[PDB]
Each structure stands twice: as structure tokens, then as C-alpha cells.
Design a protein that fits this description.
The PDB classes it as toxin. Keywords: Heat-stable enterotoxin, topological isomer, STh, toxin. It forms a monomeric assembly. With 13 residues, the protein is mostly loops. The chain is 0% helix and 0% strand. It has no helices and no strands. The relative contact order is 0.46.
């Protein structure tokens, strides 16, 4: 998770 994206690629917010 980066900020809002908790996907296994940081592209799922």
C-alpha cells in the first residue's frame, strides 16, 4: 500500500 491503493501493484485505490 502506497496511500489509498492497497493492491499488489499500487494501482487499486
Amino acid at each position: 500500500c502506497c496511500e489509498l491503493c492497497c493492491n499488489p501493484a499500487c494501482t487499486g485505490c
